[PDB]
């Protein structure tokens, strides 16, 4: 289950202000490679990772025409939703869209995805069989019947089984130097005295890729889950990620605490002390 | 699902004309195309949704509107020096297009050339009957312009489709001329015994689509208007 | 986008016809076949996604060679009603389709027992200036345009007497000339044996 490709659309109506804003973003695994914003001077699908820049002008044109046209689609879908739910044309609303493929280490499809949201809540979702839909409510139920009759699933299944898989394989090959070489975390432990009796030990994981990581504290080799303060994994800004884990420990007793780091880029799980 | 009427239209050079396109399929998107010999389908205008119209590839001199669903009327102005084409209305709901049956527009320099067909039936030869036990009738529609006719055969007051062959193409009376008049033939072949039955009635019918009320005609000959012209025969016992 | 298909194509009834198409753009992921009777609209026959090697529906089989950007339509056991113009079309999405120019497919019926003959028909109404009928010739026979300018000769066309399950070819000739006689009205062309009958 090594890899994935993902596209995310956000369509935000803003009555009073201009036409609804449309933003699209594309990812391979935890790397953003592509970007579109209907608010820009001249809206274009634009690169966000070194390895996509090598696609020629017709890739960029085709992707741009798609996004402009997808904008129109969701711009209209906002108005339909407005009617299905009987909402004021003065209110601002948001449609979100997700789709993409998962592949195993072999490059073969594991599953595809296509989900839509309205104002932050599930709306309709393609089932894992890529043949049927699950509506979240009675408004989405009308869509399901429209999409069933228009056989909208057929094209999605074709994309996800085919083009999604093949372009992802292409991208993983072109970007192999960065996409397929896991960067292990740089780890250190810091000491912060909070009184005479107690200090915080903070275990740091820095500059790692991909985002998935496990940090745990042990005392005398036994787990310390209830007592561990974990922060959410956060972007460094340079396409890598950071996380830390902390535990409050009595003075002098620091050597009994060990931090444990698991990440796909480490040959073996780390064990760290202060 | 989609109906385009009328099937044929005729207009003098430099005169606005609106073509009709109606649908009962409840599709959102509708399209206008033209088709010309030695050319396929060229887009003119399209409408993905009510109140929205976008230029196609060849809109120079065309205008459309979408005020309701159901309907998408195209208007042909003094567009190109070539507005003579076959015009096809189209809509999408699911993969691919649904098409209307199309309208033929012929735009002429002047109406001096319009003529209704003359229609004549020719009875089977006694020899064909004796040699084959089949009887072939022939219908000729001659001298017509423009090439806007629908020919049909009627046996005992109802239209027949079996046993009938009508020329796919009209003959030009004078093939070099741009505005030549046309001739078209049709055949109806029946059993010898069916033709030999003197109670059987045979009518060849030609719907001609010509001039309307508000088209000016100064020629002393009758005005070549939209009309039906017919010729008939009864069966001949031996 | 540029789609090319043969203008081409004439097959015998009962045989299998194949119509070909190529397109230039890799973004063409939706591929179609339509057929049109001349004077009417296009009717959708097949669609396929660029994903698929082949697709089958009754007598129709569509193969796609994505590498060769080559699309084909196979009609199994062609019939008389299959005669029409065939259009491949391709789209990259939003129904922004490019149609080919079209392939005219002619289906030749097998004439069982040909009896090629010229007959003269009389007007049911007025006197003379009448028509000659060339009928029952086989489907190889040409029938040529008229030498003379005041003599009109039509193309052959196929007539189906469905109740009898009987097909036959015929061509019609007429003229306002009086030195015009049916005996040699069709003689101005190639193939068959000879001519006239009428009693």
């Amino acid at each position: 289950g090594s890899h994935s490709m993902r596209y995310f659309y956000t369509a935000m109506s803003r009555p009073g202000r201009g036409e609804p804003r449309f933003i699209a973003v594309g990812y391979v695994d935890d790397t953003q490679f592509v970007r579109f914003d209907s608010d820009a001077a001249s809206p274009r699908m634009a690169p966000r990772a070194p390895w996509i820049e090598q696609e020629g002008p017709e890739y960029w044109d085709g992707e741009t025409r798609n996004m402009k046209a997808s904008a129109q689609t969701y711009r209209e879908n906002l108005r339909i939703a407005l009617r299905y739910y009987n909402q004021s044309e003065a209110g601002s609303h948001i449609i979100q869209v997700m789709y993409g493929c998962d592949v195993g280490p072999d490059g073969r499809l594991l599953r595809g995805h296509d989900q839509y949201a309205y104002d932050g809540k599930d709306y309709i979702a393609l089932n894992e069989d890529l043949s049927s839909w699950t509506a979240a409510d009675t408004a989405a139920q009308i869509i399901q019947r429209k999409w069933e009759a228009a056989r909208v699933a057929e094209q999605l299944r074709a994309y996800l089984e085919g083009l999604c898989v093949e372009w992802l394989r292409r991208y993983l090959e072109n970007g192999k130097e960065t996409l397929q070489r896991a960067d292990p975390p740089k780890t250190h432990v810091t000491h912060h005295p909070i009184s005479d009796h107690e200090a915080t030990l903070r275990c740091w994981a820095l500059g790692f890729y991909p985002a998935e990581i496990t940090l745990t504290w042990q005392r005398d080799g036994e787990d310390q889950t209830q007592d561990t303060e974990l922060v959410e994994t956060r972007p460094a800004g340079d396409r890598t990620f950071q996380k830390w884990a902390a535990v409050v420990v009595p003075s002098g007793e620091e050597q009994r605490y060990t931090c444990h780091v698991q990440h796909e880029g480490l040959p073996k799980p780390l064990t760290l002390r202060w | 699902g989609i109906t385009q009427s009328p099937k044929y239209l005729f207009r003098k050079e430099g005169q606005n004309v609106t073509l009709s396109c109606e649908q009962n399929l409840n599709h959102d998107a509708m399209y206008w195309y033209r088709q010309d010999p030695g050319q396929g389908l060229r887009l003119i205008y399209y409408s993905q949704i009510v109140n929205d119209f976008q230029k196609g590839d060849i809109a120079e001199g065309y205008s459309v509107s979408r005020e309701k669903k159901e309907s998408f009327p195209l208007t042909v102005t003094s567009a190109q020096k070539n507005p003579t084409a076959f015009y096809l209305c189209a809509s999408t709901g699911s993969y691919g297009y649904t098409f209307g049956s199309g309208t033929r527009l012929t735009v002429t320099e002047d109406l001096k050339n319009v003529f209704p067909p003359e229609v004549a039936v020719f009875e089977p030869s006694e020899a064909e009957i004796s040699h084959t036990q089949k009887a072939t009738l022939v219908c000729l529609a001659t001298g017509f312009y423009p090439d806007h006719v629908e020919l049909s055969w009627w046996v005992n007051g109802k239209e027949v489709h079996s046993g009938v062959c009508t020329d796919p193409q009209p003959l030009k009376e004078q093939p070099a001329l741009n505005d030549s008049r046309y001739s078209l033939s049709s055949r109806l072949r029946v059993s010898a015994t069916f033709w030999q039955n003197p109670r059987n009635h045979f009518r060849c019918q030609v719907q001609f689509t010509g001039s309307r009320r508000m088209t000016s005609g100064p020629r002393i000959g009758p005005k070549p208007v939209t009309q039906i012209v017919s010729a008939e025969a009864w069966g001949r016992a031996d | 986008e540029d789609v090319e298909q043969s203008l081409f194509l004439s097959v015998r009834e009962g045989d299998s016809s194949v119509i070909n198409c190529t397109y230039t753009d890799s973004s063409s992921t939706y591929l179609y076949w339509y057929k049109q009777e001349p004077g009417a609209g296009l009717q959708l026959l097949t669609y396929i996604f660029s994903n698929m090697d082949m697709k089958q529906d009754q007598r129709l089989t569509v193969l796609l060679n994505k590498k060769d950007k080559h699309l084909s339509l196979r009609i199994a056991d062609t019939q008389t009603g299959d005669s029409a113009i065939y259009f491949c079309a391709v789209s990259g999405g939003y129904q922004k389709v490019t149609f080919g120019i079209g392939t005219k497919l002619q289906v030749i019926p097998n004439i069982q027992n040909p009896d090629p003959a010229v007959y003269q028909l009389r007007d049911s109404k007025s006197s003379d200036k009448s028509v000659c009928l060339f009928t029952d010739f086989d489907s190889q026979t040409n029938v040529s345009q008229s030498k003379d300018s005041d003599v009109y000769i039509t193309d052959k066309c196929v007539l189906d007497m469905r109740s009898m399950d009987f097909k036959s070819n015929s061509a019609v000739a007429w003229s306002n000339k009086s030195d015009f006689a049916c005996a040699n009205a069709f003689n101005n062309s190639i193939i068959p044996e000879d001519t006239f009958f009428p009693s």
Partner: peptide
């Protein structure tokens, strides 16, 4: 690359 629908996913 992005999905490019033939048939709009219209609500």
């Amino acid at each position: 690359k992005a999905f490019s629908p033939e048939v709009i996913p219209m609500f």
